[PDB]
Design a protein around this ligand. Structure first.
Ligand SMILES: c1ccc(-c2c[nH]cn2)cc1
Ligand SMILES: O=C(O)CNC(=O)C(=O)O
Ligand code: NI
Ligand SMILES: [Zn+2]
Length: 331
C-alpha cells in the first residue's frame, strides 16, 4: 500500500504532465496521495494562471462575512455576520489596516501559534463563495473554470443524465479568516488555487479516519450534535491541532503559498486559516473513485446546511432513500 502513514504529498508535474488533468489526479492516487486527504501541486515553472493581478480591485464582494467566534481558544464555533458590500480594493485596504493586519511574526510556526492563541478574540471579515474565476481564458492547463463537470462524470459513470452546473468560487481573505472543519458537498474532491497574497494553512484528517474526527466533534459540541446528525455540514466548528493531538486524532498540516494548488480528496476533513490578504479560487470535481464516497456521504437534514441547486440530483440519484428527508431540509 502506497503512503500508509497518510502523509501529505507534494507534486511537481512537468509541463507535459500538466496537460491531462484527470490523468495526473489518477497518477497522484497511484502514489497514495489520497490517503492524506490533501495534496499540494506546484505548477511547472512555465505555467501561469493569468498575466497579472493588477486590475482586480473593482471585483465586488457583495456580502462580506464577519466571522464571530464563541467558545474556547482551541474549541470554538463561528457564525457569519453579513456586512455591507465592498470592492476588492476596499477589502484589501481593510485587510491591511491596523485593526486587521497580520502581526509581526518569526515564521509560519510562530504565526500558527498566534492564530490558535488569539483567533477567538477577533472577528475577521471574509469574502467567500463569490462565483467567478481569475484564470485567463487562454490558460489551457489546470484552468479551474474549464474542468469536466461533475454532472458529466456522473453521466459517464452511471449512464444517467442530470440537471445542474458546476462553476468556480473566489475567496478573498485576511489575517485570521477561518475555514471550519468540513468535507465537501457530497464528499466530492475540491481543488484550490491560491492566486495572490499571503499564505493559507491547512489541517486535514485522512479519509480512513474521518469517523474519529466526527466522534470527537460530537463530544466537543454536544448541543450541536443533538440538533443534527451531520452538524459538521454546517461548517462552523473549529478544533485546534493541540486538541486533536490530546485526543489522538490523526491529522496533518501544511501551508499553501501563492501560485500553488491544493487538492482535497473525498471524505478528507479539512480546516484552516489565512495569514493575511489573499485571493483563492476553488471548485469541486469528481472522478470514478468518488462515486462510492458520494453514495456514503452523510447529509444534514436539520435545515442549517442549505446547499446549491445542483446537489439535488446527486442525492436523488446516489441516495434515493435519503432524498425525501434531505429535500425537506432544503425546502
Ligand atoms: C467508503 C466507506 C465509508 C465512507 C464514509 C463513511 N462516512 C462517510 N463516508 C465512504 C466510503
Ligand atoms: O479556502 C477556503 O476558505 C476554503 N477552501 C476549501 O475548503 C476548499 O478549497 O475545499
Ligand atoms: Ni473545502
Ligand atoms: Zn444540520
Amino acid at each position: 500500500a502506497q503512503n500508509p502513514n497518510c502523509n501529505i504529498m507534494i507534486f511537481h508535474p512537468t509541463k507535459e504532465e500538466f496537460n491531462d488533468f484527470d490523468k495526473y489526479i489518477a497518477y497522484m492516487e497511484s502514489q497514495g496521495a489520497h490517503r492524506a486527504g490533501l495534496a499540494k501541486i506546484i505548477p511547472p515553472k512555465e505555467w501561469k494562471a493569468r498575466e497579472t493581478y493588477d486590475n482586480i480591485s473593482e471585483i465586488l464582494i457583495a456580502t462580506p462575512l464577519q466571522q464571530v467566534a464563541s467558545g474556547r481558544a482551541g474549541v470554538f464555533t463561528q457564525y457569519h455576520k453579513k456586512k455591507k458590500a465592498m470592492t476588492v480594493g476596499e477589502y484589501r485596504h481593510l485587510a491591511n489596516s491596523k485593526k486587521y493586519q497580520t502581526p509581526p511574526h518569526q515564521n509560519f510556526e510562530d504565526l500558527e501559534r498566534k492564530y490558535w492563541k488569539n483567533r477567538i478574540y477577533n472577528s475577521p471579515i471574509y469574502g467567500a463563495d463569490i462565483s467567478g474565476s481569475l484564470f485567463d481564458e487562454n490558460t489551457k492547463q489546470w484552468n479551474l473554470g474549464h474542468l469536466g463537470t461533475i454532472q458529466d462524470l456522473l453521466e459517464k459513470e452511471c449512464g444517467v443524465v442530470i440537471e445542474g452546473v458546476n462553476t468556480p468560487y473566489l475567496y478573498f481573505g485576511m489575517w485570521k479568516t477561518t475555514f471550519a472543519w468540513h468535507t465537501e458537498d457530497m464528499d466530492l474532491y475540491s481543488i484550490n488555487y491560491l492566486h495572490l497574497g499571503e499564505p493559507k494553512t491547512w489541517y486535514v484528517v485522512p479519509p480512513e479516519h474521518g469517523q474519529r474526527l466526527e466522534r470527537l466533534a460530537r463530544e466537543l459540541f454536544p448541543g450541536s450534535s443533538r440538533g443534527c446528525g451531520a452538524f459538521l455540514r454546517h461548517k462552523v466548528a473549529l478544533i485546534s491541532p493541540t486538541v486533536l493531538k490530546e485526543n489522538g486524532i490523526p491529522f496533518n498540516r501544511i501551508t499553501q503559498e501563492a501560485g500553488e494548488f491544493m487538492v482535497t480528496f473525498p471524505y478528507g476533513y479539512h480546516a484552516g486559516f489565512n495569514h493575511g490578504f489573499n485571493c483563492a479560487e476553488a471548485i469541486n470535481f469528481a472522478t470514478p473513485r468518488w462515486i462510492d464516497y458520494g453514495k456514503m456521504a452523510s447529509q444534514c437534514s436539520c435545515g442549517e446546511a442549505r446547499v446549491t441547486f445542483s446537489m439535488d440530483a446527486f442525492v436523488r440519484i446516489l441516495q434515493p432513500e435519503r432524498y425525501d428527508l434531505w429535500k425537506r431540509g432544503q425546502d
